Design a protein around this ligand. Structure first.
Ligand SMILES: *C/C=C(C)/C=C/C=C(C)/C=C/C1=C(C)CCCC1(C)C
Length: 137
């Protein structure tokens, strides 16, 4: 469907647990968690080509990809990764991430627009799954 739109969060899960697995210490986790509790997402979709803007009060991230086409972004703790997105349904894409330099936990994300209009993205580090639920602003 149309992932395109401006999205605001309504529900979050396992986000502090995600930063724990990535090795962010406790005081930092709590602070970052609260200060990134209301991230703003903007998506412009053009077929299989995607633009995503994720933004907190002082930070913003820009992501651009074509489905099927290898590109470079960063992990959640800021590490360089080669990324590949593929479709898993009409509503859902999956991205596998490969660290450009070095080793660490297995990272991936998914993006799913439900039929009832929720944008669900999940973020994964090893066996930990962070879920963020958004609706259109
Ligand atoms: C298609 C939807 C995507 C690719 C969503 C990606 C989500 C992020 C890149 C999350 C970014 C965040 C920050 C930049 C600050 C910390 C809070 C996060 C994890 C939401």
């Amino acid at each position: 469907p149309n992932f395109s739109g401006n999205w605001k969060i309504i529900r979050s899960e396992n986000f502090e647990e995600l930063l724990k697995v990535l090795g962010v210490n406790v005081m930092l986790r709590k602070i970052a968690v609260a200060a990134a509790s209301k991230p703003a997402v903007e998506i412009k979709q053009e077929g299989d080509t995607f633009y995503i803007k994720v933004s907190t009060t002082v930070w913003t991230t820009e992501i651009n990809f074509k489905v099927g086409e290898e590109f470079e972004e960063q992990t959640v703790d800021g590490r360089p990764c080669k990324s590949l997105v593929k479709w898993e349904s009409e509503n859902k894409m999956v991205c596998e991430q490969k660290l450009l330099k070095g080793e660490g936990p297995k990272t991936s994300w998914t993006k799913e627009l439900t039929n009832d209009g929720e944008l669900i993205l999940t973020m994964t580090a090893d066996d930990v799954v962070c879920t963020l639920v958004f609706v259109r602003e």
